[PDB]
Amino acid sequence: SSIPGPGYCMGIGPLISHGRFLWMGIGSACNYYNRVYGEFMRVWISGEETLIISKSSSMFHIMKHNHYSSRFGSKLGLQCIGMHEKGIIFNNNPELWKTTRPFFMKALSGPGLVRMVTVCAESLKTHLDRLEEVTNESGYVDVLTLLRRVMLDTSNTLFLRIPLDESAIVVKIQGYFDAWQALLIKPDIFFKISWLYKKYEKSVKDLKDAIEVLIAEKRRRISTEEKLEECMDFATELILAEKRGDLTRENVNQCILEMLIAAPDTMSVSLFFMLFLIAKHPNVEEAIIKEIQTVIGERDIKIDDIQKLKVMENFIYESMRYQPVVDLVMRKALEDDVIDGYPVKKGTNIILNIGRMHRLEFFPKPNEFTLENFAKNVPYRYFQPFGFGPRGCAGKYIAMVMMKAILVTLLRRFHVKTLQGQCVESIQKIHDLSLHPDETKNMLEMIFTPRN
Ligand code: HEM
Ligand SMILES: C[C@]12CCC(=O)C=C1CC[C@@H]1[C@@H]2CC[C@]2(C)C(=O)CC[C@@H]12
Numbered sequence: 001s002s003i004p005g006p007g008y009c010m011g012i013g014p015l016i017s018h019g020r021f022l023w024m025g026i027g028s029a030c031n032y033y034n035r036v037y038g039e040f041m042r043v044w045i046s047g048e049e050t051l052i053i054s055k056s057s058s059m060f061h062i063m064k065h066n067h068y069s070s071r072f073g074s075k076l077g078l079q080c081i082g083m084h085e086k087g088i089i090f091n092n093n094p095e096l097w098k099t100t101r102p103f104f105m106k107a108l109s110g111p112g113l114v115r116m117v118t119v120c121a122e123s124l125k126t127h128l129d130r131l132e133e134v135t136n137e138s139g140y141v142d143v144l145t146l147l148r149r150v151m152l153d154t155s156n157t158l159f160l161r162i163p164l165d166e167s168a169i170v171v172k173i174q175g176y177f178d179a180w181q182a183l184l185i186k187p188d189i190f191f192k193i194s195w196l197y198k199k200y201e202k203s204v205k206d207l208k209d210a211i212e213v214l215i216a217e218k219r220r221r222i223s224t225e226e227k228l229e230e231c232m233d234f235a236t237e238l239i240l241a242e243k244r245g246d247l248t249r250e251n252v253n254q255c256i257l258e259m260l261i262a263a264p265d266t267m268s269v270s271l272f273f274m275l276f277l278i279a280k281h282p283n284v285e286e287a288i289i290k291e292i293q294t295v296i297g298e299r300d301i302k303i304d305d306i307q308k309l310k311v312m313e314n315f316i317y318e319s320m321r322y323q324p325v326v327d328l329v330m331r332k333a334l335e336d337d338v339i340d341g342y343p344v345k346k347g348t349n350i351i352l353n354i355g356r357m358h359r360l361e362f363f364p365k366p367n368e369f370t371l372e373n374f375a376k377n378v379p380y381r382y383f384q385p386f387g388f389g390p391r392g393c394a395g396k397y398i399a400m401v402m403m404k405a406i407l408v409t410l411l412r413r414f415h416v417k418t419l420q421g422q423c424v425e426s427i428q429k430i431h432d433l434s435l436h437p438d439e440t441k442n443m444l445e446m447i448f449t450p451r452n
Helices: 013-024 026-036 056-064 075-081 094-107 111-128 143-159 166-183 188-192 198-223 234-243 249-280 282-295 310-322 396-411
Strands: 040-044 049-053 329-332 337-339 342-344 349-352 414-418 429-431 435-437 446-450
Touching: 013 026, 013 040, 026 040, 026 049, 026 429, 049 056, 056 337, 056 349, 075 166, 075 188, 075 198, 094 234, 094 249, 111 143, 111 396, 143 166, 143 234, 143 249, 143 396, 166 198, 166 249, 198 234, 198 249, 234 249, 249 282, 249 310, 249 396, 249 414, 249 435, 249 446, 282 310, 282 396, 310 396, 396 414
Parallel strands: 049 349
Antiparallel strands: 040 049, 329 349, 337 342, 414 446, 429 435
């Protein structure tokens, strides 16, 4: 089979599609092209031919095989944000990625995943006792900020544990994300005219500098620690690997940064959507509350509780399926292969449109929010909210633990109301690198009214 997609108009084809991506945003442009042309089609970002695919079969092939364990993006953009061959998220050097990923995998499972359930609860409790920090005169709670702050506090106390300015770092993380999202697929031309990006450059330096202060302190405490065996964590593991000859300092620093931003970026927006859904689906909210009473009562949340929270689990899955944040995955072909019917040359970029996939393929009622979509065991080859395989989400398991933990301890204590008519469907959204609320609009607040 040949490859569907717009015509290469002697070098105008590329310029339209790239422009379309820049104007529309990666996400929406992906949905546009899959709607016009097939569920498997071809576009250009910069020079490179880039496939946009929503086919579950293609999805599965790509995530399963080692020769797609790469992403893509502007080299200049990635260098600017410090992710060019440095972190893991957008580290596209196969060997450097291969040797960095293990550090993330260790910290995000085993004992750390067990600690996380209780660390999460405490962090949320502490902030729910400080609602004055985030609540309006008319009782409007800034949930986005609240969530980001606990997500950061959580990540810090688990992976780095150095005291920090919660509120400041949160704003800086938001700054970093904009830069990341802004520069990821800008053409090289863009980077020539400098009063066009120095904006983003300063956001990166803001966060990076702020984190250096923290890593610097972490280095001191380690160099004077008596029971070094007793108190291992993610940052320490990296620093020791660096003091063998295994890692670069630049690399260590980017890793710590990537580990700190991950949950604030994705978990908080995810939980936010989840909370709005709860507010608009009383039936579902009752099921959850009943399950909590049955399983937990008023005991503190514990690791052994999490498997038992079946209703919630399905709620989280359905929320993610219906209202994704991470609706698209960027990959690159490292070897030549034939995928379904189509030839895929090495160096070909790939965007997997998992959000659209979850609305076309397996589910009984794709275009409406129901736990019915999860009434029967769903094969992981038709539902990929995290990705799987050698480069699937590093936090895929701990994420489920965290989301359960915070959903439990929040709803346990508060009923959540939405302002006016507002629901996830009516929220104005940016659909670019991820799918999130446009925060230049308003009516994004909620009302937290007590229980009992
Ligand atoms: C609901 C929250 C989350 C969602 C929806 C999500 C989803 C995803 C997806 C779809 C990917 C791409 C995987 C692939 O290419 O197949 C990814 C990558 C990644 N995620 Fe998450 N994730 C979440 C939470 C987290 C958390 C809490 C962490 C750690 C604190 C994390 C760390 C990472 C890292 C480091 C990568 C890059 C992996 C690599 O390229 O090797 N994620 N995530
Ligand atoms: C999950 C994630 C990493 C942690 C973080 O801090 C924020 C995000 C959101 C964007 C994700 C990214 C991982 C790589 C993803 C899946 C892509 O290939 C395109 C969108 C992008």
